[PDB]
Structure 1
Amino acid sequence: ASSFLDTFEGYFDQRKIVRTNAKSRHTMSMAPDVTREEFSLVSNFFNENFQKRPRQKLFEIQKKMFPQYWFELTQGFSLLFYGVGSKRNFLEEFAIDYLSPKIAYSQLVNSIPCLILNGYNPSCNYRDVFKEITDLLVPAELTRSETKYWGNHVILQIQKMIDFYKNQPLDIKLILVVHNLDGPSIRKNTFQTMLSFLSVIRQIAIVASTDHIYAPLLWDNMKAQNYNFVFHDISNFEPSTVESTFQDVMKMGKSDTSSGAEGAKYVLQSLTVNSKKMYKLLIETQMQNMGNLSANTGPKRGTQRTGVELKLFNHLCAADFIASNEIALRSMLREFIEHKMANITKNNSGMEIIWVPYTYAELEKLLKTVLNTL
């Protein structure tokens, strides 16, 4: 077709005008209609059998790189892994099996806590991650002169934490492991600002990974200073079958990538029937409140106004015999809260509202495909 294939020469030469007769418009409906269960059947056979023996031998080669990375984490370098393929099974085998026992032995008993962080999850929140880090470090919380008139308490406590840890002994006491640092909810500027200032602290060791090809566009001179990555290419052509769970693969990637409701569809498939009857009751009651309050077909994502309050919800699931009391209700709610499939917050009157963060069209699709089959 084109004479040039790669340079700016190939960019300028392949972006030509195609004529209307020269366009061969074939709809993708002219294809074998593939069921979802045989999609998973053929994919799990090729991902577990096609090139294991090259990928296993490649993983034995780059396992000899592990003391060379550990020498870099003891010198204050954050450590970014790029390449083509899934880097997830590499990253949590290096950081849990190799890295964490060998820092602890070199500081002489228990291992270093290894907070790993799934950034391919589109529901990854930076305030919940920082809630986890202050449980592990237990920093001195922020005095009144330090909270500077609606200052950001997450950023202003890291800056107190840097000045504290500039005088502590140089010992790794946390390893935060960021899978897909350029993932959908973690590529935002408030998340990167958190993790850059948190990377200045030499007492915690950053081990991160990126999949997108324009990932270095995400760090300017100030963020690349605080990070000071050393970059490592680990191409291994792994399938990424866990990253292809929060995002529908039957639609080839036009599932909007930031919903999180497609990843919720995977969570419902292996639950209790009494935990699916509750969540079905929660969806159907909020679906009543979205069609009432909005008066609008178009996609608005469900928030606190459309949510059920908690004491009214306990009456709904006691008549349908899901929950016997308030505590057994709250014990099977929190498994949805930790996966952020349901949120609990209070309004301006004290009503404790429970609500599902998905749009109306994603809420009726989810109600029919997994929940209403019983």
Structure 2
Amino acid sequence: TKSASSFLDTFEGYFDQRKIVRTNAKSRHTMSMAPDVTREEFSLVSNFFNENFQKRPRQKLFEIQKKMFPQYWFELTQGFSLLFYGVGSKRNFLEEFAIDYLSPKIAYSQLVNSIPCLILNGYNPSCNYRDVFKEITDLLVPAELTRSETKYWGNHVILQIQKMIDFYKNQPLDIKLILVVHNLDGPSIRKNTFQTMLSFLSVIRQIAIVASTDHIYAPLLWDNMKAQNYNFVFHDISNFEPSTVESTFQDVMK
């Protein structure tokens, strides 16, 4: 079904491809004419093609991308948050960078255990901001709010993070926590309170932020204040990876 349009790109292509199709010019082709495929053969063919089709170019490209790892480390030490984007899964890249590379480098440069890496699976729709902050408060042990700081039915998480920001401004600038956020534009983490929480955590220089995004409209999530607080350096890392872990929360039959 190639379009009979003169244009493909820009607003010219946008206005030229949104024309009106008559009823007799439409196709009444349905999913009932498709060959029937069960879940098991779907799983079998997908894990065969995701492990043997274009695996060697993906391997060589991934070996090119780890030459960027010292530059990523240098951008994290100067206070910038890393945002990775591209076509394909970036989950293995983020855990391999943060765990196998970045945490021993930060721990050895700050001279004995390595830096803890808190992983946020934003592709999970059950990612909850209060339990993430519970894990953060166990990892960092911040001072609790006094009675005048609780305000009047305020959000205790946001007030505690603001107190944390005012505390950590007069501390040595040594990274105490590595916050990895797979799929920062995921279904529950893209909400306003979660983004506000994560940007205010990104204000703190002692927390390293390594995040990834999958949606094409992800920079719509951040206004001027959130872009100032996040302090992103953007890095395009396209690899055409399968993304099989993130697909377990959706139904592939539909």
Q: TM-score, normalised by structure 2?
A: 0.98
State the Cα distance separating 1:246 from its structure 2 match: 0.7
In structure 1, what is the equivalent of residue 223 of structure 2?
Answer: 220
Q: Which runs of 4+ in 1 moved over 6 A?
A: none
Q: Distance in 1 between the 2:222 and 2:249 partners?
A: 25
Partner SS for 1:79: strand
- Superposed CA deviations along residues 69-122 of structure 1, whole A, max 9, x for unmatched, are 000000000010000000000000000000000000000110000001100000
Q: CA deviation at 1:29?
A: 1.1
Q: Whose radius of gyration is greater, 1 or 2?
A: 1
Q: Larger relative CO (CA 8 A, sep 6+): 1 or 2?
A: 2
Question: What is the Cα deviation at residue 28 of structure 1?
Answer: 1.0
Count of residue correspondences: 251
In the TM superposition, 1:267-282 aligns within 5 A as none
For the residues of structure 2 that align with 1:121 and 1:92, how far apart are their CA atoms?
16
Alpha-carbon distance in structure 2 between the residues aligned to 1:71 and 1:213: 27
Indicate the percent of aligned positions where both proteins have the same amino acid. 100
Residue 250 of structure 1 deviates from its aligned partner by: 1.4
Cα distance in structure 1, aligned partners of 2:251 and 2:96:
27
Output one character per residue of 1:220-246: Cα deviation in whole Å (capped at 9) or x when no partner.
Answer: 000000001000000000000000001
Match of 1:113 among 112, 116, 134: 116
The corresponding residue for 1:254 is none
Cα distance, 1:25 vs structure 2: 1.3
Secondary structure of 1:23's counterpart equals coil
Question: 1:82 & 1:28 partners in 2: Cα distance?
Answer: 33
Q: Which residue pairs with 2:46 in the alignment?
A: 43
1:87 is matched with: 90
- Corresponding residue of 2:190: 187
Give how far 1:249 is off: 1.2
Distance in 1, Cα, partners of 2:187 & 2:154: 26
Which residue of 167, 172, 180 corresponds with 1:169? 172
Q: Distance in 2 between matches of 1:192 and 1:44?
A: 34
Aligned to 2:245: 242
Between the aligned partners of 2:52 and 2:186, the Cα distance in structure 1 is: 28
SS of residue paired to 1:64: helix
**Over residues 36-92 of structure 1, what are the superposed CA-to-partner deviations in whole Å (9 max), with x where a residue is unaligned?**
000000000000000110000000001100000000000000010000000000000
Q: In 2, Cα distance between the equivalents of 1:29 and 1:153?
A: 53
- Displacement of 1:140 in angstroms is 0.3
**Any idea what SS the aligned residue of 2:67 has?**
coil
Note the C-alpha offset of 1:164.
Answer: 0.3
| Structure 2: gaps spanning 5 or more residues | none
Match of 1:145 among 143, 148, 154: 148
Q: Distance in 2 between matches of 1:250 and 1:46?
A: 18
SS in 2 for 1:62: helix
Structure 1 gaps of 5+ residues are 252-374
CA distance in structure 2 between the aligned counterparts of 1:10 and 1:240, rounded to whole angstroms:
30
**SS of corresponding position for 2:66:** coil
- Secondary structure of 1:85's counterpart equals coil
Q: Distance in 2 between matches of 1:112 and 1:29?
A: 54
Task: Tell me whether 23-32 or 173-182 shows the greater mean CA deviation.
Answer: 23-32
Measure how far apart 1:141 and its partner are. Answer: 0.5
